[PDB]
Ligand binder design. Structure first.
Ligand SMILES: *[C@@H]1O[C@H](CO)[C@@H](O[C@@H]2O[C@H](CO)[C@@H](O)[C@H](O)[C@H]2NC(C)=O)[C@H](O)[C@H]1NC(C)=O
Ligand SMILES: *[C@@H]1O[C@H](CO)[C@@H](O[C@@H]2O[C@H](CO)[C@@H](O)[C@H](O)[C@H]2NC(C)=O)[C@H](O)[C@H]1NC(C)=O
Ligand SMILES: *[C@@H]1O[C@H](CO)[C@@H](O[C@@H]2O[C@H](CO)[C@@H](O)[C@H](O)[C@H]2NC(C)=O)[C@H](O)[C@H]1NC(C)=O
Ligand SMILES: *[C@@H]1O[C@H](CO)[C@@H](O)[C@H](O)[C@H]1NC(C)=O
Ligand SMILES: *[C@@H]1O[C@H](CO)[C@@H](O)[C@H](O)[C@H]1NC(C)=O
Ligand SMILES: *[C@@H]1O[C@H](CO)[C@@H](O)[C@H](O)[C@H]1NC(C)=O
Ligand SMILES: *[C@@H]1O[C@H](CO)[C@@H](O)[C@H](O)[C@H]1NC(C)=O
Lengths: 48, 96, 36, 98, 48, 42
Protein backbone atom coordinates (compact mmCIF):
# COMPACT_ATOMS: atom_id res chain seq x y z
CA UNK A 1 0.00 0.00 0.00
CA UNK A 2 2.82 2.43 0.79
CA UNK A 3 4.48 1.75 -2.57
CA UNK A 4 1.15 2.07 -4.40
CA UNK A 5 0.45 5.41 -2.72
CA UNK A 6 3.94 6.68 -3.60
CA UNK A 7 3.46 5.60 -7.22
CA UNK A 8 0.07 7.34 -7.36
CA UNK A 9 1.51 10.54 -5.89
CA UNK A 10 4.41 10.58 -8.36
CA UNK A 11 2.06 9.92 -11.28
CA UNK A 12 -0.13 12.80 -10.10
CA UNK A 13 2.89 15.09 -9.89
CA UNK A 14 4.18 14.09 -13.34
CA UNK A 15 0.73 14.32 -14.96
CA UNK A 16 1.24 18.07 -15.47
CA UNK A 17 3.22 17.25 -18.64
CA UNK A 18 0.12 16.08 -20.52
CA UNK A 19 -1.74 19.38 -19.95
CA UNK A 20 1.00 22.02 -20.16
CA UNK A 21 1.63 24.12 -23.25
CA UNK A 22 5.26 25.05 -23.90
CA UNK A 23 7.40 26.83 -26.47
CA UNK A 24 10.58 25.49 -28.09
CA UNK A 25 13.44 27.18 -26.25
CA UNK A 26 16.39 28.08 -28.45
CA UNK A 27 19.58 26.11 -27.83
CA UNK A 28 21.96 28.31 -25.87
CA UNK A 29 21.17 32.03 -25.87
CA UNK A 30 17.45 32.83 -25.61
CA UNK A 31 17.67 36.42 -26.75
CA UNK A 32 20.37 37.65 -24.39
CA UNK A 33 19.74 35.15 -21.56
CA UNK A 34 22.03 32.11 -21.49
CA UNK A 35 20.07 28.97 -20.54
CA UNK A 36 22.65 26.39 -21.63
CA UNK A 37 23.12 25.23 -18.03
CA UNK A 38 19.45 24.25 -17.63
CA UNK A 39 18.98 22.69 -21.09
CA UNK A 40 19.66 19.10 -22.11
CA UNK A 41 22.59 19.03 -24.57
CA UNK A 42 21.87 17.53 -27.99
CA UNK A 43 24.55 15.25 -29.46
CA UNK A 44 24.00 13.27 -32.67
CA UNK A 45 26.83 10.80 -31.95
CA UNK A 46 24.85 8.83 -29.37
CA UNK A 47 21.37 8.56 -27.90
CA UNK A 48 19.67 11.63 -26.45
CA UNK B 1 13.87 -5.76 -2.51
CA UNK B 2 14.48 -2.21 -3.71
CA UNK B 3 11.74 -1.48 -6.22
CA UNK B 4 12.58 0.54 -9.34
CA UNK B 5 11.18 4.07 -9.56
CA UNK B 6 7.92 4.55 -11.43
CA UNK B 7 9.53 6.63 -14.19
CA UNK B 8 12.70 6.37 -16.24
CA UNK B 9 15.15 9.27 -15.86
CA UNK B 10 14.15 10.19 -19.42
CA UNK B 11 10.61 10.87 -18.18
CA UNK B 12 11.99 13.08 -15.40
CA UNK B 13 14.09 14.88 -18.00
CA UNK B 14 10.93 15.41 -20.05
CA UNK B 15 9.17 16.77 -16.96
CA UNK B 16 11.98 19.25 -16.27
CA UNK B 17 12.17 20.25 -19.95
CA UNK B 18 8.43 20.91 -19.97
CA UNK B 19 8.90 22.97 -16.80
CA UNK B 20 11.63 24.99 -18.53
CA UNK B 21 9.45 25.49 -21.60
CA UNK B 22 6.45 26.50 -19.49
CA UNK B 23 8.21 29.45 -17.83
CA UNK B 24 7.57 31.96 -20.62
CA UNK B 25 4.07 33.35 -21.01
CA UNK B 26 1.81 36.37 -20.74
CA UNK B 27 2.05 36.67 -16.93
CA UNK B 28 -0.51 39.50 -16.90
CA UNK B 29 -3.87 37.88 -17.74
CA UNK B 30 -6.73 37.05 -15.39
CA UNK B 31 -6.79 33.28 -15.86
CA UNK B 32 -4.79 30.24 -16.96
CA UNK B 33 -6.86 29.16 -19.98
CA UNK B 34 -4.82 30.93 -22.68
CA UNK B 35 -1.17 30.38 -23.58
CA UNK B 36 0.78 33.29 -25.06
CA UNK B 37 3.87 32.42 -27.13
CA UNK B 38 5.96 35.20 -25.59
CA UNK B 39 9.72 34.46 -25.77
CA UNK B 40 11.77 33.86 -22.65
CA UNK B 41 13.60 37.20 -22.64
CA UNK B 42 10.35 39.14 -23.07
CA UNK B 43 8.76 37.13 -20.26
CA UNK B 44 11.72 37.83 -17.95
CA UNK B 45 11.57 41.55 -18.74
CA UNK B 46 7.81 41.54 -18.10
CA UNK B 47 8.41 39.85 -14.75
CA UNK B 48 10.95 42.57 -13.95
CA UNK B 49 8.40 45.22 -14.95
CA UNK B 50 5.80 43.63 -12.69
CA UNK B 51 8.38 43.64 -9.89
CA UNK B 52 8.46 47.44 -10.02
CA UNK B 53 11.10 48.32 -12.62
CA UNK B 54 9.80 50.75 -15.22
CA UNK B 55 10.09 50.10 -18.95
CA UNK B 56 12.60 52.94 -19.39
CA UNK B 57 15.01 51.24 -16.98
CA UNK B 58 14.47 47.85 -18.64
CA UNK B 59 15.10 49.28 -22.11
CA UNK B 60 18.20 51.18 -20.97
CA UNK B 61 19.68 48.33 -18.90
CA UNK B 62 18.98 45.44 -21.27
CA UNK B 63 22.50 44.03 -21.61
CA UNK B 64 23.29 44.80 -17.95
CA UNK B 65 20.26 42.82 -16.76
CA UNK B 66 21.08 39.96 -19.13
CA UNK B 67 24.69 39.87 -17.91
CA UNK B 68 23.62 39.85 -14.26
CA UNK B 69 21.17 37.01 -14.94
CA UNK B 70 23.90 35.05 -16.73
CA UNK B 71 26.29 35.68 -13.83
CA UNK B 72 23.69 34.31 -11.42
CA UNK B 73 23.14 31.23 -13.59
CA UNK B 74 26.90 30.68 -13.74
CA UNK B 75 27.25 31.09 -9.97
CA UNK B 76 24.53 28.45 -9.56
CA UNK B 77 27.36 25.91 -9.96
CA UNK B 78 29.06 26.83 -6.67
CA UNK B 79 26.02 25.89 -4.57
CA UNK B 80 26.73 22.15 -4.77
CA UNK B 81 28.96 22.10 -1.70
CA UNK B 82 28.50 20.96 1.89
CA UNK B 83 28.04 24.59 2.99
CA UNK B 84 24.71 24.94 1.17
CA UNK B 85 21.59 23.91 3.07
CA UNK B 86 19.65 22.51 0.09
CA UNK B 87 22.53 20.28 -1.02
CA UNK B 88 22.76 19.12 2.59
CA UNK B 89 19.05 18.26 2.36
CA UNK B 90 19.68 16.25 -0.82
CA UNK B 91 22.48 14.31 0.85
CA UNK B 92 20.29 13.87 3.94
CA UNK B 93 17.51 12.31 1.87
CA UNK B 94 20.04 10.00 0.21
CA UNK B 95 21.48 9.08 3.62
CA UNK B 96 18.01 8.35 5.03
CA UNK C 1 -7.28 -8.97 -24.14
CA UNK C 2 -9.60 -11.56 -22.61
CA UNK C 3 -3.30 -14.40 -23.96
CA UNK C 4 0.10 -13.02 -22.95
CA UNK C 5 1.01 -9.86 -21.05
CA UNK C 6 2.63 -7.10 -23.11
CA UNK C 7 5.34 -4.65 -22.05
CA UNK C 8 4.63 -1.02 -22.93
CA UNK C 9 6.62 2.14 -22.23
CA UNK C 10 5.21 5.13 -20.37
CA UNK C 11 5.47 8.29 -22.47
CA UNK C 12 3.77 11.63 -21.83
CA UNK C 13 3.08 13.58 -25.03
CA UNK C 14 3.03 17.26 -24.14
CA UNK C 15 0.61 19.44 -26.14
CA UNK C 16 2.00 20.86 -29.36
CA UNK C 17 4.47 23.65 -28.65
CA UNK C 18 3.33 27.12 -29.71
CA UNK C 19 6.33 28.37 -31.67
CA UNK C 20 6.65 32.16 -31.30
CA UNK C 21 6.23 34.17 -34.49
CA UNK C 22 8.89 36.54 -35.82
CA UNK C 23 6.23 39.23 -36.39
CA UNK C 24 5.78 42.42 -34.37
CA UNK C 25 3.68 40.99 -31.55
CA UNK C 26 3.00 37.43 -30.43
CA UNK C 27 0.57 34.56 -30.98
CA UNK C 28 -1.79 33.55 -28.16
CA UNK C 29 -4.10 30.52 -28.08
CA UNK C 30 -7.40 31.99 -26.85
CA UNK C 31 -10.18 29.46 -26.10
CA UNK C 32 -13.24 29.27 -28.33
CA UNK C 33 -14.94 26.31 -26.61
CA UNK C 34 -14.98 25.23 -22.98
CA UNK C 35 -16.34 22.79 -20.43
CA UNK C 36 -16.63 22.82 -16.64
CA UNK D 1 -15.96 24.77 -5.11
CA UNK D 2 -18.62 22.78 -3.25
CA UNK D 3 -17.82 20.92 -0.02
CA UNK D 4 -19.97 18.01 1.14
CA UNK D 5 -19.69 15.62 4.09
CA UNK D 6 -17.46 12.56 3.80
CA UNK D 7 -17.24 9.67 6.31
CA UNK D 8 -14.10 11.08 7.97
CA UNK D 9 -13.77 14.58 6.53
CA UNK D 10 -14.91 16.92 3.77
CA UNK D 11 -15.27 16.11 0.07
CA UNK D 12 -14.61 19.01 -2.30
CA UNK D 13 -15.97 19.35 -5.84
CA UNK D 14 -13.66 21.86 -7.53
CA UNK D 15 -15.44 23.24 -10.60
CA UNK D 16 -12.97 24.84 -13.00
CA UNK D 17 -12.98 26.49 -16.41
CA UNK D 18 -11.54 23.93 -18.84
CA UNK D 19 -11.04 25.05 -22.46
CA UNK D 20 -11.42 22.41 -25.17
CA UNK D 21 -10.77 24.22 -28.47
CA UNK D 22 -8.31 27.07 -29.01
CA UNK D 23 -7.69 29.60 -31.77
CA UNK D 24 -4.31 31.03 -32.76
CA UNK D 25 -4.74 34.81 -32.52
CA UNK D 26 -2.26 37.48 -33.58
CA UNK D 27 -1.86 39.60 -30.44
CA UNK D 28 -0.01 42.81 -29.64
CA UNK D 29 1.83 43.76 -26.46
CA UNK D 30 0.27 47.22 -26.71
CA UNK D 31 -0.72 49.98 -29.09
CA UNK D 32 -0.09 53.70 -29.40
CA UNK D 33 -0.06 56.56 -31.88
CA UNK D 34 2.58 58.95 -33.25
CA UNK D 35 2.65 62.02 -30.99
CA UNK D 36 5.56 63.96 -29.53
CA UNK D 37 4.50 62.73 -26.08
CA UNK D 38 3.31 59.20 -26.90
CA UNK D 39 0.20 57.73 -25.24
CA UNK D 40 0.50 53.94 -25.08
CA UNK D 41 -2.16 51.52 -23.83
CA UNK D 42 -2.18 47.89 -22.71
CA UNK D 43 -5.03 45.39 -22.37
CA UNK D 44 -6.71 44.73 -19.03
CA UNK D 45 -7.32 41.03 -18.27
CA UNK D 46 -7.10 40.22 -21.96
CA UNK D 47 -5.21 40.65 -25.21
CA UNK D 48 -5.17 43.11 -28.11
CA UNK D 49 -6.04 40.66 -30.87
CA UNK D 50 -6.13 41.25 -34.62
CA UNK D 51 -9.00 39.10 -35.90
CA UNK D 52 -12.18 40.89 -36.95
CA UNK D 53 -15.51 40.67 -35.14
CA UNK D 54 -17.21 38.89 -38.10
CA UNK D 55 -3.76 44.22 -40.36
CA UNK D 56 -3.94 47.43 -38.31
CA UNK D 57 -7.47 47.09 -36.86
CA UNK D 58 -6.89 45.84 -33.31
CA UNK D 59 -9.65 44.50 -31.06
CA UNK D 60 -9.87 43.36 -27.44
CA UNK D 61 -10.63 39.80 -26.37
CA UNK D 62 -10.91 38.10 -23.02
CA UNK D 63 -8.18 35.80 -21.77
CA UNK D 64 -10.44 32.76 -21.37
CA UNK D 65 -12.65 33.20 -24.45
CA UNK D 66 -11.99 34.55 -27.95
CA UNK D 67 -14.45 37.33 -28.80
CA UNK D 68 -12.94 40.46 -30.39
CA UNK D 69 -14.45 43.71 -29.12
CA UNK D 70 -13.68 47.38 -29.80
CA UNK D 71 -10.86 48.75 -27.65
CA UNK D 72 -12.12 51.31 -25.13
CA UNK D 73 -11.02 52.72 -21.79
CA UNK D 74 -13.10 49.99 -20.14
CA UNK D 75 -10.74 47.19 -21.25
CA UNK D 76 -7.47 49.11 -21.65
CA UNK D 77 -5.05 50.94 -19.36
CA UNK D 78 -2.51 53.68 -20.02
CA UNK D 79 1.12 52.56 -19.80
CA UNK D 80 4.53 54.04 -20.49
CA UNK D 81 6.22 53.58 -23.86
CA UNK D 82 7.42 50.09 -24.72
CA UNK D 83 9.37 49.55 -27.94
CA UNK D 84 7.49 46.29 -28.58
CA UNK D 85 4.17 48.16 -28.82
CA UNK D 86 2.48 48.64 -32.17
CA UNK D 87 2.76 52.14 -33.63
CA UNK D 88 -0.68 52.96 -35.03
CA UNK D 89 -1.20 55.69 -37.62
CA UNK D 90 -4.67 54.59 -38.78
CA UNK D 91 -7.73 53.13 -37.05
CA UNK D 92 -6.83 54.56 -33.65
CA UNK D 93 -8.90 53.30 -30.70
CA UNK D 94 -10.72 55.99 -28.68
CA UNK D 95 -8.08 55.76 -25.91
CA UNK D 96 -5.40 56.55 -28.51
CA UNK D 97 -7.30 59.49 -30.02
CA UNK D 98 -6.09 62.99 -29.17
CA UNK E 1 -16.03 37.47 -15.58
CA UNK E 2 -13.15 37.58 -13.10
CA UNK E 3 -11.67 34.51 -14.80
CA UNK E 4 -11.32 36.50 -18.02
CA UNK E 5 -14.63 36.05 -19.84
CA UNK E 6 -16.07 39.38 -20.93
CA UNK E 7 -19.64 40.39 -20.12
CA UNK E 8 -20.63 40.23 -23.80
CA UNK E 9 -19.80 36.51 -23.96
CA UNK E 10 -21.51 35.84 -20.62
CA UNK E 11 -24.67 37.60 -21.81
CA UNK E 12 -24.59 35.78 -25.15
CA UNK E 13 -23.92 32.26 -23.81
CA UNK E 14 -26.00 32.32 -20.64
CA UNK E 15 -27.99 29.13 -21.25
CA UNK E 16 -24.93 27.36 -22.68
CA UNK E 17 -22.89 28.11 -19.56
CA UNK E 18 -25.76 27.04 -17.32
CA UNK E 19 -26.16 23.78 -19.26
CA UNK E 20 -22.44 23.02 -19.03
CA UNK E 21 -22.47 23.69 -15.28
CA UNK E 22 -25.50 21.41 -14.88
CA UNK E 23 -23.77 18.69 -16.91
CA UNK E 24 -20.72 18.95 -14.65
CA UNK E 25 -22.86 18.73 -11.51
CA UNK E 26 -24.69 15.71 -12.94
CA UNK E 27 -21.43 14.02 -13.94
CA UNK E 28 -20.14 14.52 -10.38
CA UNK E 29 -21.92 11.23 -9.56
CA UNK E 30 -19.59 9.16 -11.75
CA UNK E 31 -16.59 9.97 -9.54
CA UNK E 32 -17.69 7.65 -6.71
CA UNK E 33 -15.85 4.64 -8.13
CA UNK E 34 -12.58 2.89 -7.33
CA UNK E 35 -10.85 4.67 -10.24
CA UNK E 36 -11.08 8.11 -8.62
CA UNK E 37 -8.23 9.11 -6.32
CA UNK E 38 -10.32 11.09 -3.82
CA UNK E 39 -12.80 8.24 -3.31
CA UNK E 40 -9.80 5.96 -2.82
CA UNK E 41 -8.60 8.40 -0.15
CA UNK E 42 -12.00 8.25 1.57
CA UNK E 43 -11.95 4.46 1.60
CA UNK E 44 -8.31 4.55 2.76
CA UNK E 45 -9.24 6.71 5.75
CA UNK E 46 -12.11 4.35 6.58
CA UNK E 47 -9.77 1.36 6.24
CA UNK E 48 -7.17 2.98 8.52
CA UNK F 1 9.88 61.18 -5.68
CA UNK F 2 11.43 64.65 -5.61
CA UNK F 3 14.90 64.26 -7.13
CA UNK F 4 15.44 65.60 -10.63
CA UNK F 5 16.01 63.48 -13.73
CA UNK F 6 19.59 64.82 -14.20
CA UNK F 7 11.21 71.37 -4.14
CA UNK F 8 7.82 71.28 -5.89
CA UNK F 9 8.76 69.35 -9.06
CA UNK F 10 7.60 65.79 -8.39
CA UNK F 11 8.59 62.81 -10.54
CA UNK F 12 7.64 59.14 -10.63
CA UNK F 13 10.05 56.27 -9.96
CA UNK F 14 9.65 52.53 -9.78
CA UNK F 15 9.69 50.74 -6.45
CA UNK F 16 12.61 48.47 -7.36
CA UNK F 17 14.80 51.02 -9.16
CA UNK F 18 15.37 54.76 -8.76
CA UNK F 19 14.80 56.52 -12.09
CA UNK F 20 12.61 59.65 -11.88
CA UNK F 21 10.11 60.07 -14.71
CA UNK F 22 7.41 62.65 -15.46
CA UNK F 23 4.10 61.95 -13.74
CA UNK F 24 1.39 60.93 -16.21
CA UNK F 25 -1.85 58.95 -16.16
CA UNK F 26 0.21 55.87 -17.05
CA UNK F 27 1.94 55.73 -13.65
CA UNK F 28 -0.63 57.52 -11.46
CA UNK F 29 -4.21 56.90 -10.36
CA UNK F 30 -6.95 59.21 -9.09
CA UNK F 31 -7.71 58.89 -5.37
CA UNK F 32 -9.87 60.69 -2.84
CA UNK F 33 -8.56 63.70 -0.94
CA UNK F 34 -5.96 62.94 1.74
CA UNK F 35 -4.59 65.46 4.22
CA UNK F 36 -1.03 64.10 3.98
CA UNK F 37 -1.00 64.73 0.22
CA UNK F 38 1.10 67.57 -1.16
CA UNK F 39 -0.86 70.64 -2.27
CA UNK F 40 0.66 71.78 -5.56
CA UNK F 41 0.16 75.31 -6.89
CA UNK F 42 3.01 75.20 -9.44
C1 LIG G 1 26.54 30.17 -21.97
O1 LIG G 1 26.70 29.21 -20.95
C2 LIG G 1 27.38 28.05 -21.37
C3 LIG G 1 27.29 27.04 -20.25
O2 LIG G 1 27.66 27.65 -19.03
C4 LIG G 1 28.81 28.40 -21.79
O3 LIG G 1 29.46 27.29 -22.38
C5 LIG G 1 30.72 27.06 -21.73
O4 LIG G 1 31.73 27.87 -22.29
C6 LIG G 1 32.99 27.74 -21.66
C7 LIG G 1 33.91 28.82 -22.18
O5 LIG G 1 34.06 28.67 -23.58
C8 LIG G 1 33.51 26.31 -21.89
O6 LIG G 1 34.73 26.09 -21.23
C9 LIG G 1 32.50 25.32 -21.33
O7 LIG G 1 32.85 23.99 -21.63
C10 LIG G 1 31.11 25.58 -21.91
N1 LIG G 1 30.13 24.69 -21.34
C11 LIG G 1 29.75 24.62 -20.05
C12 LIG G 1 28.69 23.58 -19.77
O8 LIG G 1 30.19 25.32 -19.15
C13 LIG G 1 28.79 29.51 -22.83
O9 LIG G 1 30.07 30.01 -23.11
C14 LIG G 1 27.93 30.69 -22.36
N2 LIG G 1 27.87 31.73 -23.35
C15 LIG G 1 27.36 31.65 -24.60
C16 LIG G 1 27.46 32.93 -25.40
O10 LIG G 1 26.86 30.65 -25.08
C1 LIG H 1 7.40 52.13 -32.55
O1 LIG H 1 8.03 53.38 -32.50
C2 LIG H 1 9.01 53.47 -31.49
C3 LIG H 1 9.39 54.93 -31.33
O2 LIG H 1 9.79 55.45 -32.58
C4 LIG H 1 10.17 52.54 -31.85
O3 LIG H 1 11.12 52.49 -30.81
C5 LIG H 1 12.44 52.74 -31.34
O4 LIG H 1 12.86 51.69 -32.18
C6 LIG H 1 14.13 51.92 -32.76
C7 LIG H 1 14.37 50.88 -33.83
O5 LIG H 1 14.35 49.60 -33.26
C8 LIG H 1 15.19 51.94 -31.65
O6 LIG H 1 16.47 52.22 -32.15
C9 LIG H 1 14.84 53.03 -30.65
O7 LIG H 1 15.69 53.01 -29.53
C10 LIG H 1 13.40 52.86 -30.15
N1 LIG H 1 13.02 53.92 -29.25
C11 LIG H 1 12.87 55.22 -29.54
C12 LIG H 1 12.45 56.08 -28.38
O8 LIG H 1 13.07 55.72 -30.65
C13 LIG H 1 9.64 51.12 -32.01
O9 LIG H 1 10.61 50.26 -32.53
C14 LIG H 1 8.43 51.07 -32.95
N2 LIG H 1 7.85 49.76 -32.88
C15 LIG H 1 7.40 49.06 -33.94
C16 LIG H 1 6.84 47.71 -33.59
O10 LIG H 1 7.43 49.47 -35.09
C1 LIG I 1 -3.34 70.39 1.78
O1 LIG I 1 -4.56 71.09 1.81
C2 LIG I 1 -5.57 70.42 2.55
C3 LIG I 1 -6.89 71.10 2.27
O2 LIG I 1 -6.79 72.47 2.59
C4 LIG I 1 -5.16 70.40 4.02
O3 LIG I 1 -6.06 69.63 4.79
C5 LIG I 1 -6.50 70.40 5.93
O4 LIG I 1 -5.45 70.63 6.84
C6 LIG I 1 -5.83 71.41 7.95
C7 LIG I 1 -4.59 71.81 8.72
O5 LIG I 1 -3.93 70.65 9.17
C8 LIG I 1 -6.86 70.64 8.77
O6 LIG I 1 -7.33 71.40 9.87
C9 LIG I 1 -8.07 70.32 7.90
O7 LIG I 1 -8.99 69.49 8.55
C10 LIG I 1 -7.61 69.60 6.63
N1 LIG I 1 -8.71 69.32 5.74
C11 LIG I 1 -9.47 70.22 5.08
C12 LIG I 1 -10.55 69.61 4.22
O8 LIG I 1 -9.34 71.43 5.16
C13 LIG I 1 -3.80 69.72 4.16
O9 LIG I 1 -3.28 69.83 5.45
C14 LIG I 1 -2.77 70.32 3.20
N2 LIG I 1 -1.59 69.51 3.21
C15 LIG I 1 -0.33 69.98 3.25
C16 LIG I 1 0.73 68.92 3.27
O10 LIG I 1 -0.05 71.17 3.27
C1 LIG J 1 -18.61 24.03 -28.39
O1 LIG J 1 -18.56 22.62 -28.42
C2 LIG J 1 -19.83 22.00 -28.35
C3 LIG J 1 -19.62 20.51 -28.18
O2 LIG J 1 -18.68 20.27 -27.16
C4 LIG J 1 -20.64 22.37 -29.60
O3 LIG J 1 -21.94 21.84 -29.55
C5 LIG J 1 -20.77 23.88 -29.67
O4 LIG J 1 -21.39 24.30 -30.86
C6 LIG J 1 -19.39 24.54 -29.61
N1 LIG J 1 -19.51 25.97 -29.57
C7 LIG J 1 -18.82 26.83 -30.34
C8 LIG J 1 -17.85 26.21 -31.31
O5 LIG J 1 -18.96 28.05 -30.27
C1 LIG K 1 -2.27 26.73 -33.76
O1 LIG K 1 -0.95 26.45 -34.16
C2 LIG K 1 -0.46 25.22 -33.65
C3 LIG K 1 1.02 25.12 -33.92
O2 LIG K 1 1.68 26.26 -33.41
C4 LIG K 1 -1.28 24.07 -34.24
O3 LIG K 1 -0.90 22.83 -33.70
C5 LIG K 1 -2.76 24.28 -33.91
O4 LIG K 1 -3.58 23.34 -34.54
C6 LIG K 1 -3.21 25.67 -34.35
N1 LIG K 1 -4.57 25.91 -33.95
C7 LIG K 1 -5.55 26.36 -34.77
C8 LIG K 1 -5.13 26.62 -36.20
O5 LIG K 1 -6.70 26.56 -34.40
C1 LIG L 1 -8.19 36.28 -37.97
O1 LIG L 1 -7.27 36.02 -36.93
C2 LIG L 1 -5.94 35.82 -37.37
C3 LIG L 1 -5.12 35.34 -36.19
O2 LIG L 1 -3.91 34.78 -36.65
C4 LIG L 1 -5.43 37.11 -38.00
O3 LIG L 1 -4.11 36.98 -38.48
C5 LIG L 1 -6.31 37.44 -39.20
O4 LIG L 1 -5.96 38.67 -39.79
C6 LIG L 1 -7.78 37.52 -38.78
N1 LIG L 1 -8.62 37.67 -39.93
C7 LIG L 1 -9.69 38.49 -39.98
C8 LIG L 1 -10.44 38.49 -41.30
O5 LIG L 1 -10.05 39.18 -39.04
C1 LIG M 1 17.73 64.72 -4.97
O1 LIG M 1 17.01 63.82 -4.15
C2 LIG M 1 16.84 64.27 -2.82
C3 LIG M 1 16.26 63.14 -2.00
O2 LIG M 1 16.43 63.40 -0.62
C4 LIG M 1 15.98 65.54 -2.83
O3 LIG M 1 15.78 66.06 -1.54
C5 LIG M 1 16.71 66.61 -3.64
O4 LIG M 1 15.94 67.77 -3.78
C6 LIG M 1 17.04 66.09 -5.03
N1 LIG M 1 17.87 67.04 -5.74
C7 LIG M 1 17.72 67.35 -7.04
C8 LIG M 1 18.70 68.37 -7.56
O5 LIG M 1 16.87 66.85 -7.76
Amino acid sequence: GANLRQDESIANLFSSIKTQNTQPLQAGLNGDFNLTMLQIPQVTTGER
Amino acid sequence: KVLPPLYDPYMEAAYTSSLLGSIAGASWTAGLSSFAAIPFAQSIFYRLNGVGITQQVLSENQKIIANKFNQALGAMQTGFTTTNLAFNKVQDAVNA
Amino acid sequence: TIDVFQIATLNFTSPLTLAPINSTGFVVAVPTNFTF
Amino acid sequence: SFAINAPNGLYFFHVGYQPTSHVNATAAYGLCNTENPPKCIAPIDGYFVLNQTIDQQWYYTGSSFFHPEPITEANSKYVSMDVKFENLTNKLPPPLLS
